[PDB]
Design a protein around this nucleic acid. Sequence first.
RNA 1: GGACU
Length: 164
Amino acid sequence: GTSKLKYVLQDARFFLIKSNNHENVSLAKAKGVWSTLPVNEKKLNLAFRSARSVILIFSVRESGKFQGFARLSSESHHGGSPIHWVLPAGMSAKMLGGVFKIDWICRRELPFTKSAHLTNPWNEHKPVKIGRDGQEIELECGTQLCLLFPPDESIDLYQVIHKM
RNA sequence: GGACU
């Protein structure tokens, strides 16, 4: 149970991911891909090569919740077939043309009320819920946060661990 | 910095 999760969380770097809509997170859950803006895309590629795992912790903006977490399985790829993202106003397809493959670790939600005790030393010790897209979460805070999520009754950590 | 609370 936790032994497999804790294994996957070991050596990890944790990034907060924000989405302006629910639909992109749902497409991401369904297809196992994500795109972020260029600045974070660069930070994520770099992180991928420095840690056994990079964990993306998803939160839809103004939702009052996290919607789950995933592990990067690839660096971003460009020049492939574009994802049908819902593009917030002023944002172009080109800005989210970097496509990362991800393997979901937990598709279950976690209301911010359940993480209120966790603060992030890498964001001025603000509660972990507060953070821009791509904000890195310190090791202890990130690990403990992921551990708060309800167990995902439908993901078998065999393949995820297999890949690593 | 063009998907913080």
